[PDB]
Design a binder for this molecule. Structure first.
Ligand SMILES: CCCCCCCCCCCCCCCCCC(=O)OC[C@H](COP(=O)([O-])OCC(O)COP(=O)([O-])OC[C@@H](COC(=O)CCCCCCCCCCCCCCCCC)OC(=O)CCCCCCCCCCCCCCCCC)OC(=O)CCCCCCCCCCCCCCCCC
Ligand SMILES: CCCCCCCCCCCCCCCCCC(=O)OC[C@H](COP(=O)([O-])OCC(O)COP(=O)([O-])OC[C@@H](COC(=O)CCCCCCCCCCCCCCCCC)OC(=O)CCCCCCCCCCCCCCCCC)OC(=O)CCCCCCCCCCCCCCCCC
Ligand SMILES: CCCCCCCCCCCCCCCCCC(=O)OC[C@H](COP(=O)([O-])OCC(O)COP(=O)([O-])OC[C@@H](COC(=O)CCCCCCCCCCCCCCCCC)OC(=O)CCCCCCCCCCCCCCCCC)OC(=O)CCCCCCCCCCCCCCCCC
Ligand SMILES: CCCCCCCCCCCCCCCCCC(=O)OC[C@H](COP(=O)([O-])OCC(O)COP(=O)([O-])OC[C@@H](COC(=O)CCCCCCCCCCCCCCCCC)OC(=O)CCCCCCCCCCCCCCCCC)OC(=O)CCCCCCCCCCCCCCCCC
Ligand SMILES: CCCCCCCCCCCCCCCCCC(=O)OC[C@H](COP(=O)([O-])OCC(O)COP(=O)([O-])OC[C@@H](COC(=O)CCCCCCCCCCCCCCCCC)OC(=O)CCCCCCCCCCCCCCCCC)OC(=O)CCCCCCCCCCCCCCCCC
Ligand SMILES: CCCCCCCCCCCCCCCCCC(=O)OC[C@H](COP(=O)([O-])OCC[N+](C)(C)C)OC(=O)CCCCCCCCCCCCCCCCC
Ligand SMILES: CCCCCCCCCCCCCCCC(=O)OC[C@H](COP(=O)(O)O)OC(=O)CCCCCCCCCCCCCCC
Ligand SMILES: [K+]
Lengths: 212, 88, 202, 127, 77, 98, 113, 49
């Protein structure tokens, strides 16, 4: 158990072809013997080290689907990281992707709820930070609509939350470091847009920036 | 129902208790008519309702107020005249 | 009930203005092409800002996308009660178009990796896992800026927002929003803005 | 353009802007108690509910039932989910309650003369 | 020449460097005149006479808010 | 567009007050019967008094009054009284007034 | 003639408005009366804000430490979240209710110790 | 040119340098007081004057 995990770690660090084959074989044989924690750890290690056979990854997907309900937050995060830094030729079946997507969305929603309850100004601060340098058309967006039902939704009329959107954003650095000027901000945005376009040719970040 | 019994006069019924304890906390708001501001608010609301009724009076069976009539003007104007909260 | 009263009066005014518009159209040249040439007039623009809604037929096809956007921007910027009335009217659209995103785990993780590499999420959220912060930021964007999903890609919008936020400073920042048209906001804004800080670039 | 005006009138009279509750209230206000279909036929509403100068027992029973039902609904909703935007009216009521609590604290720990002077100065500055 | 209540109020009041700004708090600083007494009949008759005389003497003084010699302020702070 | 001042229009006034104090100090530098420590921690009224005597010597000393030409729209007889009146009103609201 | 007179009136009105709106920037008026008026307005605004802050500070100093947290929450809300739409008062109410839960627990402990 | 602003500055200089307004020749007093009392203005106001 512990010795096998240490051997897998050492072989992954060494990064030799025969060692990877021997690992793959041993882990494939002992998937059932190993518990959920060991399986998650080895999957994360294989993902970070960028190795593993397609059959091994498929069987790992099957095991993860089978044992998903008994996973904690750390185990889910490690599995997500491994399946993210998995080998390219690892087209997964349409259950593990769904499980991971649902788990990630639920974790995000729960974190948002907890942070908002701890500090009601969390969402307001994030929105203000996002909209500080945002464009006028971005700021023009409408306000949130009340989805709650009842008398006001059935027999009454509920006034919308929209109000005038002519506001001035005053940005001050908490640490006190000098802030970037307009030209520096434009250069930073252009560089980020160029990098994003290189990653994805179809992005319209150029048009978005040129708009305002 | 039988409104006839209620209409009928009776010594005990006349001299009995008509307003109970529960009604006082539910009806004490009627003393706000003492305030000129409340009287003005009520007059404005009544005038607005009369205007709405007059505008919608085109439908059959609904007639708005006529300024010519003396009774309507007098009753609308002297509703709060001489109001005194101290005298029962 | 105040909103209802305002809406009713605005509706009466709108109906009267539409009757006048029809009468003027039937009396004058009666050409939509001729009418469209005055959309840039000062008083015509004021009238549009006053009685133009996307859910009504007034100037239904006589305005272009740019003109409609400019009218909406002006109304949203310098007309509180008109904004209230038109936002109430906009409820009649009942669009309620909710669209999911990031269907493929591969694409979602690739986007997360790109965002993590090109930005530091610890600044946005302190003492939290990077993936959790990324998911929370996605949820915030979906809640707030989803209105643009009709035309703007979610990933592109998120990248634009992150780049604009990080352009100011690659560190924690404090943002204060003020509407100087309001008394309280104006007093707070003047009290909080200092010339020395602006000169020092803090 | 007449059809367009008719469509605009229908939209302006739509439910989301002119509540059906407002329509019902207007109908009741314009109609008498013998012409109102909702109550002319019903003797209980016209006599037992709205026909008594004092109906404290029935009012109390109705209030108790409504309070129990609303408490049950609120508890169920809170237990199920809470990340739903609420109505502007309720939000404003809660804001007013919080502001009233803060104002009570300020009045408790401050003098009436000081409060009056501060309010007068603030009003003058606003003007 | 001041008291502990006024000292507490002044120390709580922070970031004030102008006498006019402090005078804006003159009503708050007036709370230092606690004049604590019981409500016995004799003490109530006193309170009545003393407060009426204080109103009369303040009328005779006719000092404005700017000049408040009996309200300690920035110098003592 | 408004009578109120913006944030960028108050640092200038603070510099005006400081400049008035410094001008007084520079002018009365060679005066024994002068204590400048009194200028430390001035009250609002004292700052206003100093700003009253503030002066800016880098401004041009000649009068800035001048004449500007705004071309008119000659009356058009081909339109009519009301059409010309509306044209004049829109011109005033769009070009002449701004 | 009439047009020239109307334009003269308009020019005088515009000059008057420009003066009344921006006379605090220049020293055309001797003694800088508009500048002093604007400085006085800003001083009054800042003094009012600092007065609110100092009243909060003194109330905080005098408040019992048990409800000092509740006072802090109420003060912060009244200052910032009253005018902010993104700040949901439900969360503030939840914090107040947690504080009240602690207070009720202490009360019941005292009652039934 | 006889520019208005320059002429105003020159006439101010002439009036102040004529010597008729030398402070040494004046004993500033409140005036409105029943008794003759010196100037009661603040030190900053005196320096500004
Ligand atoms: C004037 C015209 C009259 C025409 C009459 C014609 C007859 C038909 C009338 C139809 C309307 C009534 C019936 C339907 C109501 C439907 C409501 C609904 O479902 O909407 C959901 C609606 C949702 O709100 P929202 O739109 O999201 O807005 C959020 C606001 O927070 C919510 O507020 P708001 O900003 O939206 O505005 C409403 C606001 C107030 O707004 C108004 O003033 C309303 C103004 C009139 C509006 C009229 C609209 C209808 C017009 C119909 C006629 C059209 C005719 C068209 C034809 C042509 C005519 C020429 O009401 C309140 O919330 C008041 C609560 C506090 C009590 C105030 C009164 C007592 C004084 C208390 C003072 C305390 C001070 C501190 C202590 C001091 C101690 C000394 O819910 C409410 O507004 C709830 C209101 C609860 C209280 C109502 C009752 C109290 C008095 C109200 C004001 C006075 C008017 C009373 C009626 C008068 C009738 C004559
Ligand atoms: C967001 C919220 C959501 C809520 C949701 C939930 C809602 C739930 C439902 C709630 C429903 C709530 C519904 C109800 C709410 C509203 C209720 C309502 O209407 O109440 C407002 C109510 C309406 O007033 P009203 O009865 O319609 O007014 C009658 C008209 O003024 C007609 O008066 P008049 O013309 O026949 O004769 C009096 C004459 C004025 O002629 C006089 O001078 C009368 C003098 C009378 C004798 C004064 C003696 C003072 C010495 C001490 C007392 C000696 C003992 C004898 C006192 C006898 C009573 C006065 O008045 C005038 O003409 C004045 C011009 C009117 C415009 C200016 C208005 C100013 C404010 C009104 C009071 C002004 C008083 C001025 C006094 C003189 C100042 C130099 O207002 C008042 O009660 C008065 C104003 C507030 C006073 C507060 C005082 C607090 C304590 C101060 C202590 C420290 C100072 C003591 C000495 C005095 C100062 C030096
Ligand atoms: C039923 C008839 C109604 C009509 C007639 C009404 C009376 C005539 C009109 C008088 C009008 C002018 C006012 C004169 C009295 C002024 C008293 C005063 O300011 O004393 C300062 C005294 C000390 O206050 P402090 O220094 O600010 O702080 C005290 C702290 O608690 C710190 O204290 P501690 O914790 O260290 O403990 C000590 C504390 C402990 O105090 C307590 O809380 C303990 C409570 C023990 C039981 C209380 C009931 C027993 C005494 C009843 C009063 C005597 C008989 C009244 C009826 C006479 C006709 C049959 O005691 C004291 O501090 C001293 C209290 C002694 C003063 C009150 C005694 C006389 C009151 C009656 C009026 C005087 C004239 C009567 C003429 C005819 C007979 C000769 O203030 C009070 O405690 C005032 C309390 C409220 C008094 C309300 C008026 C009297 C009501 C008596 C009950 C009557 C039945 C209920 C219904 C009444 C009709 C609605
Ligand atoms: C409302 C319900 C009923 C009333 C309930 C009770 C009262 C509640 C409200 C008041 C609560 C607070 C009570 C007072 C607390 C103490 C306040 C305080 O600190 O004041 C002391 C005050 C401190 O002020 P400060 O430092 O001088 O600063 C001056 C500032 O202006 C700053 O001045 P300030 O803001 O400090 O002003 C002080 C003023 C603050 O209080 C007030 O302002 C009063 C507020 C309530 C009354 C408001 C009345 C408004 C009247 C106009 C409105 C219309 C009325 C219509 C009426 C119609 C019906 C008649 O104090 C008072 O006057 C308190 C009077 C309280 C009794 C009120 C009732 C009076 C009734 C009179 C009836 C008429 C006469 C008898 C009958 C005649 C006909 C037969 O003075 C002292 O410390 C005195 C020290 C003792 C020696 C003085 C020697 C003076 C002569 C030498 C001068 C030269 C000195 C050496 C050279 C210079 C230095 C080297
Ligand atoms: C003591 C009493 C108590 C109150 C205090 C006292 C108040 C005193 C107020 C005094 C006001 C004086 C105004 C002087 C204006 C001088 C204009 C001028 O330079 O003249 C040359 C001008 C030369 O015309 P032009 O510019 O060469 O154009 C001709 C081209 O060939 C044709 O060019 P185009 O075809 O290329 O384009 C233009 C054409 C294009 O077509 C249009 O645009 C025609 C539009 C027609 C009206 C459409 C709406 C129909 C519904 C009824 C009105 C409701 C109000 C809404 C109006 C919306 C805007 C029109 O329209 C025209 O032809 C323009 C002239 C239209 C005249 C016909 C309408 C007259 C009545 C208007 C309504 C008056 C208020 C009624 C209130 C309700 C009474 C029950 O003269 C005219 O042709 C028109 C002169 C009009 C003089 C009006 C004098 C009114 C005196 C009585 C006032 C009181 C009336 C009753 C109400 C009482 C309330 C208490
Ligand atoms: C229809 C009813 C009408 C009622 C109108 C009554 C008007 C009475 C007006 C009296 C004015 C007296 C002015 C002189 C100063 C009085 C003392 C003072 O300044 O108060 C503060 C004093 C000082 O209290 P304190 O020391 O706590 O002051 C707090 C403020 N600091 C902290 C600065 C000290 O208050 C008292 O001592 C108690 C005052 C209330 C006493 C009430 C007694 C009973 C009253 C019964 C009703 C009125 C009499 C009967 C009327 C019959 C009419 C037909
Ligand atoms: C078991 C349920 C039976 C009833 C079901 C349908 C009820 C629908 C209508 C609601 C009741 C209206 C009664 C009107 C007649 C009346 O009350 O008649 C009794 C008196 C009549 O007043 P007047 O004597 O001035 O005419 O009413 C009052 O004094 C006012 C009481 C409130 C009435 C309106 C209802 C308000 C909401 C009730 C809950 C809030 C607390 C109420 C007090 C505990
Ligand atoms: K200005």
């Amino acid at each position: 158990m512990s010795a096998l995990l240490k051997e897998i770690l050492a072989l992954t660090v060494k990064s030799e072809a025969a060692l990877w084959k021997g690992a793959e074989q041993k882990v494939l044989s002992g998937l059932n013997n190993l518990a959920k924690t060991e399986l998650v750890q080895i999957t994360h290690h294989f993902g970070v080290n960028k190795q593993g056979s397609e059959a091994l990854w498929s069987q790992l997907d099957k095991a993860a689907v089978g044992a998903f309900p008994e996973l904690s937050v750390d185990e889910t995060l490690q599995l997500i990281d491994g399946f993210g830094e998995c080998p390219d030729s690892y087209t997964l079946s349409h259950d593990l992707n769904q499980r991971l997507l649902v788990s990630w969305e639920q974790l995000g929603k729960l974190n948002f709820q907890k942070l908002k309850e701890t500090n009601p100004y969390f969402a307001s601060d994030i929105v203000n930070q996002l909209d500080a340098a945002a464009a006028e058309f971005i700021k023009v967006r409408p306000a949130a609509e009340s989805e709650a039902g009842g008398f006001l939704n059935s027999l009454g009329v509920s006034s919308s939350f929209n109000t005038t959107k002519n506001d001035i954003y005053v940005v001050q650095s908490a640490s006190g470091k000098k802030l970037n000027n307009k030209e520096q901000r434009e250069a930073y945005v252009l560089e980020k847009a160029q990098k994003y376009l290189k990653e994805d040719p179809q992005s319209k970040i150029l048009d978005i920036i040129a708009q305002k | 129902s039988d409104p006839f019994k209620k209409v009928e006069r009776d010594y005990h019924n006349e001299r009995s208790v008509h307003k109970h304890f529960a009604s006082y906390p539910l009806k004490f708001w009627w003393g706000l008519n003492k305030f000129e501001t409340i009287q003005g608010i009520h007059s404005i609301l009544g005038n607005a309702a009369d205007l709405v009724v007059s505008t919608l009076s085109f439908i059959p069976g609904v007639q708005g107020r006529n300024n010519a009539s003396y009774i309507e003007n007098s009753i609308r104007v002297t509703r709060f005249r001489g109001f005194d909260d101290k005298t029962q | 009930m105040t909103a209802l009263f305002l809406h009713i009066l605005w509706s009466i005014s709108y109906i009267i203005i539409n009757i006048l518009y029809i009468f003027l159209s039937l009396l004058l040249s009666n050409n939509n092409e001729k009418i469209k040439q005055y959309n840039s007039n000062y008083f015509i623009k004021i009238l549009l800002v006053l009685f133009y809604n996307k859910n009504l037929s007034f100037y239904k096809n006589l305005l272009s996308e740019d003109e409609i956007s400019k009218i909406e921007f002006e109304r949203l910027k310098n007309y509180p009660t008109l904004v209230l009335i038109h936002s109430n009217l906009n409820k009649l659209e009942k669009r309620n178009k909710i669209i999911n995103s990031f269907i493929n785990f591969k694409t979602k993780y690739r986007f997360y990796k790109f965002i993590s590499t090109n930005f530091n999420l610890q600044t946005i959220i302190k003492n939290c896992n990077d993936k959790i912060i990324f998911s929370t930021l996605l949820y915030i964007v979906n809640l707030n800026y989803s209105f643009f999903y009709k035309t703007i890609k979610n990933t592109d919008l998120i990248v634009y927002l992150l780049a604009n936020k990080f352009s100011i400073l690659n560190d924690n920042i404090i943002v204060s929003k003020f509407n100087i048209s309001k008394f309280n906001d104006y007093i707070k804004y003047i009290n909080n803005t200092n010339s020395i800080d602006t000169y020092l670039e803090n | 353009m007449f059809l367009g005006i008719f469509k605009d009138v229908i939209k302006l009279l739509n439910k989301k802007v002119v509540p059906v509750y407002f329509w019902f209230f207007l109908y009741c206000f314009l109609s008498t108690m013998d012409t109102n279909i909702f109550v002319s036929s019903c003797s209980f509403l016209k006599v037992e509910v709205f026909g008594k100068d004092e109906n404290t027992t029935l009012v109390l029973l109705f209030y108790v039932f409504y309070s129990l039902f609303n408490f049950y609904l609120s508890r169920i909703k809170n237990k199920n989910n809470y990340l739903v935007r609420k109505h502007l009216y309720t939000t404003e009521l809660l804001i007013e309650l919080i502001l009233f609590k803060y104002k009570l604290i300020i009045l408790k720990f401050s003098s009436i003369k000081y409060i009056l002077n501060f309010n007068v100065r603030k009003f003058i500055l606003f003007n | 020449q001041t008291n502990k209540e006024w000292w507490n109020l002044a120390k709580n009041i922070q970031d004030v460097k102008c006498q006019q700004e402090l005078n804006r708090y003159n009503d708050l600083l007036s709370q230092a005149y606690t004049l604590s007494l019981d409500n016995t009949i004799r003490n109530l008759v006193f309170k009545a006479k003393f407060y009426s005389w204080l109103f009369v003497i303040n009328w005779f003084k006719a000092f404005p808010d700017d000049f408040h010699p009996f309200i300690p302020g920035l110098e003592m702070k | 567009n408004s009578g109120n001042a913006l944030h960028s229009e108050y640092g200038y006034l603070e510099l005006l007050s400081n400049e008035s104090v410094q001008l007084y100090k520079d002018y009365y530098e060679s005066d024994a019967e002068e204590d400048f420590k009194v200028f430390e921690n001035l009250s609002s009224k004292e700052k206003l008094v100093m700003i009253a005597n503030f002066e800016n010597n880098l401004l041009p000393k000649y009068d800035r009054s001048e004449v500007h030409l705004i071309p008119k729209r000659q009356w058009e007889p081909a339109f009519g009284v009301w059409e010309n009146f509306l044209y004049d009103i829109t011109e005033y609201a769009s070009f002449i007034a701004p | 003639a009439i047009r020239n007179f109307v334009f003269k009136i308009s020019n005088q009105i515009q000059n008057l408005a420009a003066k009344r709106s921006l006379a605090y920037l220049n020293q055309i008026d001797s003694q800088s009366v508009p500048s002093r008026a604007t400085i006085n307005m800003k001083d009054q605004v800042t003094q009012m804000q600092r007065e609110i802050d100092n009243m909060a500070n003194v109330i905080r100093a005098q408040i019992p430490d048990e409800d000092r947290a509740e006072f802090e929450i109420l003060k912060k809300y009244y200052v910032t979240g009253q005018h902010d739409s993104l700040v949901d008062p439900q969360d503030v109410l939840l914090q107040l209710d947690r504080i009240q839960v602690l207070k009720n627990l202490k009360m019941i402990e005292l009652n039934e110790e | 040119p006889e520019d208005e602003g320059i002429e105003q500055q020159l006439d101010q200089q002439e009036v102040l340098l004529s010597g008729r307004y030398d402070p040494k020749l004046y004993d500033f007093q409140e005036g409105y007081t029943k008794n003759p009392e010196d100037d009661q203005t603040s030190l900053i106001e005196k320096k500004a004057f």
